[PDB]
Design a protein around this ligand. Structure first.
Ligand code: HN4
Ligand code: NAG
Ligand code: ZN
Length: 1016
């Protein structure tokens, strides 16, 4: 049945880790093709019976924000490009154009008058204007979570199906900074047949070009059979611009960019301008151009050649459409009429190219190689590796993951019911999906936009978060109120969300205190939501106005709780120390919530005059020389003081952690009898070069290995409780916290790089683990890929995206660091892991941004740190390119990305309150997730439809007996099911009508989508 993703090493023609191991990466001057060689061809290769078919594909690369905001670019550029495309294509039936970014197209189309909408539909229907990919954006592939890549793809394609009646099956990704196999994974499961990529390391382009392996069947690294394969075309040259798309010599190709003759303010840096094509020069101009084409064709296996014709925000003015079209028409008429060239050239679309390639393949003229792996870390030239943007603007990288989860929770919570249009549910969800989707752009989440554009993305995401909160809290109120009592005001806040980790303590004072008192309000209901499809327990905390608070479930059963102080860290500009202050009127109450699969659970917080039976109080110990008092109001335990010293902590039966006198982890002891394993946290700094190329938003160009941050004698705070303990230390630029709840610790860093120009702050772990040169990092939160550190490459080349986790291991021991935000990282020596926290760069790095990164703001980064024995685990063989998490590490990642949601009832009394929702939902096996639950129909539809995306990961077998769990059939989650269909991941095409209306569970590493239809 299911493929084995662990024990069968796929046999592929090109495996990128193996290729990397072999390649020398020499950066030699190749001639006019600076990073290649002087291409030679046999003029006799093409003849009357075997012609070269050339497709010139006009395009315009439109960024949804970069140097201008989305709306600024729309007003200044994109609306004119689309208006003039409509006119020019209408009037010139053989002209063609491709379009990628549906965020822009949807904005444009909705503003068109009906006559023009109809004209637009006609040029799409007739194949002149073709959508490529059809996502809301052209996303980053490094930092983006797969769930959000799918979200934005679905947003654009759903719009295209509704308004344009088309669904692209070819993808175009010319600008993201390196490429991920997560893209073909999602695309192939969304109906695609072909994809195109561009930004891959120049040494990779050279190597693959030499072997004619630039077109390949790209399969996943674990896929033995090849069912995940997607045909992929990699472009061969340095850029997608016209100089780098006609052939290997940009001095020649630039002369065929007819916008560069002067009047448009553009020119050719190779110092030979374009000249207007005429009868007196067409033969000569054609001989130069066809020669470039035939050289390019040498790099590929068929007689069908792709020639993109475009650049950033091109095809804006009428005069530009004319100058490109008329000159190319003259070239085509000459070339096609002169038999000696043996060429047939025309304007075409991307799909037309791929269709012709596969026709050639089926005619037996070519066979294509198979490939697995990724295309990180990209370098466009010399030692300029683009690993900086794995970290740039980390506040917004963290915000991405928070909004990811809020969109999921809002769509899921509201899916259970049909809503009246007056509730504005669909409206708020569309807004939230679109703002999160926009941020997936390769200048959004990447942190590579101008300051004011970053602010625009942030404002949009803030509005999206508020939209999600509104939908979530309306849904909770409906799900947990007696039906005959429920009386909604769709504008009212029945609950407010409480989020302990966003924006975070020390970032924003955003959380509401639950105010209780004998003379105001004795008690408060709170509700937790669990978006995961299994029963889950998690500690939750709330701020309360008294320490004398106890917790009950709605059956009035006492729940054990812990109260701790509210501690805030302050950079004391008088004493020049960083030290914690405690509140004398707010306290934290902490208790274990237990919540059904995809469900809700209600608890009550009640005040009393004195210490409640079932609530304990943490001790607090402040370690510093020169302490001063720390009063805590009614908090019943006095703060203790001491000189800095090593300390050890253990919560529950979990690990025992030892810390240095500077408050940093030094060892983990898994069990009572077991060893104290060395695991040391350290903070270091990278700088910037004083000569040569400077680091900026894209590039990481360190001035050598990192240097330790000088710590001084930092203040350390130890809080010890029955349920939760922690060690926090105020370091320069980082308040570092290790939190213990009885399992793997949680690490939080409040990172404020302040005014430290030209500094990158890294967090490193040093261990004994004999990892050598191997480490593992994830791709888009979907899969873990084996990395090999290569000393033949510079330090920055060995940095990779850490979108959600990384690990090192030897025969016996593994250390895994899971993240709540994408950041850059590496393992630069055996036994180490490191991950960048923030970077502040004074200089521009010459990729068009025109500024450094000087807009840093405090960010709360979150992690889980999992030390495990793996000697008993069934792991892939030494040649397998993948790795897999254990159950504990996977659950730890879920605790970061999809925590319980917390709701505080706003009013004094909740009439008709219920204790639970979802107690009857199946508790699915731990490796299965309902990644998406989305109602697809509005309330007017007689047949309601609900869509589910189901993802099964693969966890290592390590000898923990499996306990029986329940089968999850998503098609029966809502009553009155009438049909169940397997669909593409975007929900746009029905693939299978399912027997018995039962949606089968998926195989390890597979993702499927199902839609259930309901008659009532
Ligand atoms: C002229 C010079 C300053 C030397 C320059 C060099 C390279 C680039 C890009 O690669 C820009 C690429 C690559 C980086 C990316 O941020 C941008 C935008 O998305 C836009 O679509 C083009 N993208 C730009 C300028
Ligand atoms: C939409 O596309 C399909 C496939 O070509 C076609 O059968 C259908 O009639 C089109 N719908 C409209 C309204 O043109
Ligand atoms: Zn771009």
């Amino acid at each position: 049945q299911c493929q084995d993703v662990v024990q069968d090493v796929p046999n592929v023609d090109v495996q990128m880790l193996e290729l990397y191991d072999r390649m020398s990466f020499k950066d030699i001057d190749g001639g006019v093709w600076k990073q290649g060689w002087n291409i030679k061809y046999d003029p006799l290769k093409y003849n009357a019976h075997h012609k070269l078919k050339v497709f010139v594909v006009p395009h315009s690369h439109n960024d949804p924000g970069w140097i201008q905001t989305f709306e600024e670019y729309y007003q200044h550029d994109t609306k004119h490009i689309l208006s003039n495309a409509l006119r020019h294509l209408h009037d010139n039936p053989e002209m063609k154009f491709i379009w990628a970014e549906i965020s822009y197209f949807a904005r444009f189309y909705h503003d068109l008058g009906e006559n023009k909408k109809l004209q637009m539909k006609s040029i799409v229907k007739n194949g002149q204007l073709e959508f490529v990919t059809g996502g809301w954006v052209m996303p980053d592939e490094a930092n983006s979570h797969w769930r959000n890549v799918l979200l934005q793809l679905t947003e654009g394609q759903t719009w295209l199906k509704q308004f344009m009646n088309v669904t692209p099956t070819a993808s175009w990704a010319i600008d993201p900074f390196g490429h991920s196999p997560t893209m073909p994974y999602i695309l192939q499961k969304s109906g695609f047949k072909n994809m195109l990529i561009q930004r891959t390391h120049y040494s990779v382009k050279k190597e693959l070009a030499q072997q004619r392996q630039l077109e390949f069947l790209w399969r996943q690294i674990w896929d033995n059979k090849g069912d995940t394969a997607l045909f992929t075309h990699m472009m061969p040259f340095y850029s997608y611009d016209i100089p780098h798309t006609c052939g290997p010599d940009p001095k020649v190709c630039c002369q065929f960019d007819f916008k560069r003759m002067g009047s448009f303010g553009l020119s050719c840096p190779w110092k030979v301008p374009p000249r207007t094509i005429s009868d007196q020069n067409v033969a000569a101009r054609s001989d130069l151009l066809v020669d470039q084409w035939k050289k390019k064709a040498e790099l590929y296996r068929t007689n069908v050649l792709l020639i993109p014709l475009g650049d950033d925000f091109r095809f804006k003015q009428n005069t530009e459409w004319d100058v490109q079209r008329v000159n190319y028409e003259r070239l085509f008429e000459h070339i096609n009429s002169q038999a000696h060239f043996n060429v047939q050239a025309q304007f075409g679309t991307l799909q037309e190219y791929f269709d012709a390639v596969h026709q050639a393949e089926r005619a037996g003229q070519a066979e294509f190689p198979t490939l697995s792996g990724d295309f990180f870390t990209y370098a466009d030239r010399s030692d300029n590796y683009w690993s900086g943007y794995y970290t740039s603007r980390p506040y917004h990288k963290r915000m991405d993951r928070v909004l990811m989860h809020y969109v999921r929770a809002a769509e899921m919570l509201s899916a259970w019911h049909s809503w009246d249009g007056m509730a504005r549910i669909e409206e708020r969800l569309e807004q939230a999906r679109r703002e999160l989707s926009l941020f997936q752009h390769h200048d959004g989440i990447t942190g590579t936009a101008k300051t004011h554009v970053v602010v625009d993305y942030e404002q949009r995401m803030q509005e999206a978060l508020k939209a999600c909160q509104m939908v979530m809290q309306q849904s909770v109120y409906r799900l947990l109120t007696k039906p005959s009592i429920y009386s909604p005001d769709f504008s009212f806040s029945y609950f407010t969300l409480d989020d302990s980790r966003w924006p975070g303590s020390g970032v924003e004072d955003s959380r509401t205190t639950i105010i209780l008192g004998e003379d105001i309000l004795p008690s408060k209901h709170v509700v937790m939501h669990n978006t995961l499809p299994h029963w889950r327990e998690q500690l939750v905390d709330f701020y309360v106005s008294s320490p004398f608070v106890s917790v009950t479930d709605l059956a009035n059963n006492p729940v054990e709780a812990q109260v701790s102080p509210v501690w805030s860290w302050h950079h004391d500009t008088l004493t020049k120390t960083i030290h914690p202050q405690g509140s004398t009127t707010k306290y934290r109450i902490i208790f274990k919530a237990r919540v059904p699969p995809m469900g809700l659970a209600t608890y009550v917080l009640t005040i009393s005059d004195s210490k409640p039976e079932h609530t304990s109080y943490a001790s607090n110990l402040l370690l510093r020389k020169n302490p001063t008092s720390l009063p805590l109001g009614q908090y019943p335990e006095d703060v203790k003081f001491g000189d800095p010293r090593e300390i050890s902590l253990r919560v529950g039966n979990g690990p025992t952690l030892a810390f240095s006198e500077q408050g940093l982890l030094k060892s983990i002891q898994l069990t009572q009898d077991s060893p104290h394993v060395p695991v040391h946290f350290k903070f270091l700094k990278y700088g910037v070069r004083s000569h040569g190329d400077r680091s900026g938003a894209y590039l990481f160009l360190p001035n050598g290995p990192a240097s330790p941050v000088e710590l001084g004698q930092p203040v350390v705070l130890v809080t010890k409780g029955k349920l939760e303990s922690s060690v926090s230390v105020g370091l320069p630029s980082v308040v570092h916290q290790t939190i213990m709840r009885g399992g793997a610790p949680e690490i939080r860093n409040l990172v404020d790089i302040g005014s430290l120009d030209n500094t990158e702050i890294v967090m490193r772990l040093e261990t004994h683990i004999d990892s050598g040169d191997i480490f593992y990092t994830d791709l888009n939160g979907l899969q873990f890929i084996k990395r090999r550190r290569l000393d033949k490459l510079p330090l920055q080349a060995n940095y990779y995206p850490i979108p959600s986790g990384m690990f090192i291991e030897d025969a016996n021991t593994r250390l895994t660091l899971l993240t709540g935000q994408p950041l850059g990282g590496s393992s630069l020596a055996s036994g180490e892991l490191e991950i960048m926290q923030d970077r502040r760069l004074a200089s521009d790095d010459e990729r068009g941004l025109g500024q450094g990164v000087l807009d840093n703001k405090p960010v709360l980064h979150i992690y889980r740190l999992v030390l495990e024995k793996v000697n008993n685990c069934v792991r892939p063989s030494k040649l397998h390119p993948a790795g897999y998490l254990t159950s504990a590490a996977h659950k730890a990642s879920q605790s970061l990305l999809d925590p319980l949601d917390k709701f505080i009832f706003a009013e004094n009394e909740w009439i008709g309150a219920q204790g639970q929702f979802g107690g009857d939902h199946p508790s699915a096996r731990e490796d299965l997730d309902v990644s998406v639950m989305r109602r697809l129909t509005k309330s007017s539809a007689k047949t309601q439809r609900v869509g589910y995306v189901l993802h099964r990961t693969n966890l290592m077998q390590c000898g923990t007996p499996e306990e029986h769990t329940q089968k999850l059939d998503v098609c029966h989650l809502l009553p009155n099911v009438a049909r169940c269909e397997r669909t593409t991941l975007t929900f746009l095409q029905n693939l299978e009508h399912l027997d018995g209306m039962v949606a089968p569970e998926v195989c390890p590493m597979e993702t499927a989508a199902y839609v259930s239809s309901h008659s009532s």
